[PDB]
Amino acid sequence: GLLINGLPGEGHYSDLIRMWRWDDFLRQPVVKGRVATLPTTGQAEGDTYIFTGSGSNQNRLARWWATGATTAIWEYMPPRLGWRVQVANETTPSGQVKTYEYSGTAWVELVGGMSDAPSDGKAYARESGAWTELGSAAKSALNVLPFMNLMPDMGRFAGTAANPLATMFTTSWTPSSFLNGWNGATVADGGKFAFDNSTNGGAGPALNARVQALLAAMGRTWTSVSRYGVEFFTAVLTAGSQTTTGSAGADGVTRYLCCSNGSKTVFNAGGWATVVMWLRVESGSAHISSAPYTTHRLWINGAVAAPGVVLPANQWVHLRFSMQSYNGYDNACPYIYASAGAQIAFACPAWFGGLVDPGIHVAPILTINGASA
Amino acid sequence: GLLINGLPGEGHYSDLIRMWRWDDFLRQPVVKGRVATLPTTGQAEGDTYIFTGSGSNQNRLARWWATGATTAIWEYMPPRLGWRVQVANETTPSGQVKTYEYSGTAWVELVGGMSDAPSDGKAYARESGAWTELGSAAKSALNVLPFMNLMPDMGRFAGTAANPLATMFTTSWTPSSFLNGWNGATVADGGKFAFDNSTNGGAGPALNARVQALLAAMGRTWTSVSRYGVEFFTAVLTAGSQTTTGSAGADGVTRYLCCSNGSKTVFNAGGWATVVMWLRVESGSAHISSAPYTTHRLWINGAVAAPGVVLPANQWVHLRFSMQSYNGYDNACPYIYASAGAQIAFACPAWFGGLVDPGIHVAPILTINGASA
Amino acid sequence: GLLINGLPGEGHYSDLIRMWRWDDFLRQPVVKGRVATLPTTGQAEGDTYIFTGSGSNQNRLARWWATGATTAIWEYMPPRLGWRVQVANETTPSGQVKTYEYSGTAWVELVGGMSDAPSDGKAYARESGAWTELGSAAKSALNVLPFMNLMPDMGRFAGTAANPLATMFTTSWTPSSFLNGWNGATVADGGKFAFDNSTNGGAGPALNARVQALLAAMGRTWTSVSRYGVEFFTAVLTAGSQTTTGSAGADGVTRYLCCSNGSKTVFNAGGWATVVMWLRVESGSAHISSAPYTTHRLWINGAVAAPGVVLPANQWVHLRFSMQSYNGYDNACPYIYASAGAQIAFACPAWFGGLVDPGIHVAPILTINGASA
């Protein structure tokens, strides 16, 4: 509380000049900026800086009154539990004039908001100008959802008669129908990982260089996850001498298709497909696709990639190629071309009948068959 | 910057009347509306229109001062880098008085908002007055998710021994256990689509009128999707002469159930069920359900529908009937009644053990069995 | 519209004191609070209460002017289609000074909001300071999604040769490979529920006390869901006399593992696992886990629970233990320890290869096998 009313009439003229000088200021209370020191030069009528220098005169106004004036002075305005003040020069990207609403102790930003979600445990999203509750599926991620694999043998190259539910298998190596050679390509066994193996202090088979390279790429370096694990076979495909179905990669190098799926019945869900598999180049060079065609999206170890990217030689890379095709089927779905004589290592393929996001997997996803018991 | 202070005292009275006339206006700066021309009639004290007519006097105030006045004039107020001004007459639906905050060049709407999502790649939804991050599953749609089909033969009417993973099959027509006749209804083979068929320039079997009608309904008119595709059989069910389990449709016409599922063990997931199948009426009439009972929701080619709707005769329609039942089982789940002697064409049924949204499918969804290799 | 301009100069001094007393008030129009009666005591200069007592003087200001005054009076300010007025003392939790914007008929809260979702049917969530559309999966819940079960026999203890798709089975009791005894534990048949049973007016087998206890726990008390249902066997595991793998519960009582899964290949999806099963304690005591280890989350009939909670004796409880393990496999996954000689009743187990939320299930989730036709 404060007053400037009353006072002898003898001095009314001083206070009357005084009140006119504010009534002139009150047109729009906008400050050009906050200052800890009175501008000693370059100020005129209409210049208002917030004199917040250390002392009792913090936040006091510092309007300079020279134009149309007898003697210019730094007229002061102590605030008192002040409130919203607009600022013109700087502004938010959304076109809002900056406002420091002085809450009485600090310069606070203006506050709004015409909607708060009811506190009843449901998440609400904006819909047609109204907030609508969301379901539980919104919060759950996709890397953990247990979707069904379409491969009967899990890519272990042991045959469908092997139980996918068992940790260990005794069946020998077996070719998979999901990987058919193309252009004369030859597929041969590359290696196998055994439970309780001897390389890490056991009595089983030993691990060959390719498997250590994979596991180091997998991050499974700890005994609990490196000395134990599920069994499976690896294979190495040698590109044939045939030169059918040519294609060029992102680097402009021509290559030919080496493997095919045998026209599997996967393109059903909106034409959507997903292929995830682990590979490494032992010799030669290869790329993905031919050129950007239709819709496509490639992730390499969780990093988006473009068509034709030449995978670095002798490194394990996680690929996830998801695209859409209403044709209902395709034989060369992978769209992978490699140079003749290239030795490509690959292990644990996984295919899905739609767009799914399991992340960087570490083992094939299970299914159910007659031998699954 | 501007000033009206000073000036000889001789004329102080003019400016003093002047400042009083504003101090009267400053009670609440609300404009009745924007005008490009001064109102030549129908204005009085308290009427304030924004004179924005073309010229230098844009945005100048146009308050008319007649009540309690000697001679009324259009007193002018040039703004200068102006700011928020409230408006009373019109208002937003949410009870907010309209505000054109003049940004110095244009009349801008007031701006607020007390929450912005952190720029770290996560989507945030409002929860109990706070923004909570959402999962990846929120963004993905439902028409592409590869869920597991419950039919062993894919509705191809070829038997479970046929591989659902193959594009082509050689097994002959075979009845499906998922469609059991009711009220004496007879189910007979209707047709088959063959890969590399001869109708579109091949050497295989030809396509009969029903299959062209379906495909035209399917939108598969292009050679890539019309001259090729997966094989499957069609069947036509002729309603029997029995009159058990009567029911009336939306048009008030009584009909009887014709087919049953044989009490399949589908009602497990919260009692939820989903049936999707493609059909066409060759003769007679039929409807869906008996009357609105329990919870129910029908889509016809993506368009919601009510119970008892009489499907148009001789057109292919996509139905998706999802409901809930805690009983754990039901034989007449479809709740479809047709007139006696009606010839109903149907192809590619698909059932699911819950509420799923695959859209307008084009082929049955695959499963895995012993013959799937 | 109103005016206080003009009037004879003789009385100019009264109105001039008058206008000064407002020009003093207009520094910041903040009211200390609304009052239906003028404060008869404890008021001074700067105290402004909204006199809203019943009568024509509603909303009129009640500023008391005593400091620096000749005679203090309750100066009145009728509003007219008023607008936003800030309030200092009380405030919103978000630091916003309370504002009752008088809409001319009622004291209305201030209104903002710089974003409304386009009215085109899509739900929008905030992302990096912008609203991004969400997918359909966001709205759908998780309790209804038809995910694939990993048990070949559905936990009916009838063998994999039994069809899971049929409501009724004739095969006798059969042990399940998914529940292997530990520490010498013995598993024996406990009971079976038969379709069209005689206990509820049929001709089939009768129901034993354990099954009524379960069903009453299930809420299936109605004839439609109590007199009918799917068939399955129950078993009772008697803990053995061996004392290997000790562990203590939340109450500090030591117990030993009684059953194991035989190292099933379930830990694939991000290492995520889900186990849901229905059990009741007939004798002894048991608890969950050993102590809080790694990540873990237990729901008991939809209510979250902590490790080591001793389940109440002789009550049916729904458990859902979901955890993560990158090891790829585990034999004692359940981590359940029971006292020696404890008689534990259990029925309808369900396991999943990831985090899933089917709610409180009433029957095992189906799968597909060679005998599923």
Author numbering:
A (entry chain B), B (entry chain B), C (entry chain B): 10 to 382
From the paper:
Bacteriophage Casadabanvirus JBD30, from the order Caudoviricetes, is a temperate phage that infects the bacterium Pseudomonas aeruginosa. The virion of bacteriophage JBD30 is composed of an icosahedral capsid, long flexible non-contractile tail, and a baseplate. Using its baseplate, JBD30 attaches to Pseudomonas aeruginosa via the bacterial type IV pilus, whose subsequent retraction brings the phage to the bacterial cell surface.
The baseplate of JBD30 is terminated by a tripod formed by three trimers of receptor binding proteins (gp54). The receptor binding protein can be divided into thigh, knee, and foot domains. The N-terminal thigh domain (residues 1–118) connects the receptor binding protein to domain VII of the baseplate hub protein. The C-terminus of the baseplate hub protein docks into the centre of an α-helical bundle that each receptor binding protein contributes one α-helix to. The α-bundle is surrounded by peripheral β-sheets. The knee domain extends from the thigh domain, then bends back in an antiparallel β-sheet and ends in a short α-helix. The C-terminal foot domain of the receptor binding protein has the overall shape of a wedge, which is composed of a central β-sheet flanked by an α-helical spur. The JBD30 receptor binding protein foot domain is structurally similar to sugar-binding domains of hydrolytic enzymes (such as xylanase, glycoside hydrolase, endoglucanase, mannose, galactosidase) and an enzymatically active domain of bacteriophage cba120 tail spike protein. Aromatic residues of two adjacent foot domains form a hydrophobic cleft suitable for sugar binding. Therefore, we speculate that the foot domain of the JBD30 receptor binding protein recognizes and binds the host cell lipopolysaccharide O-antigen.
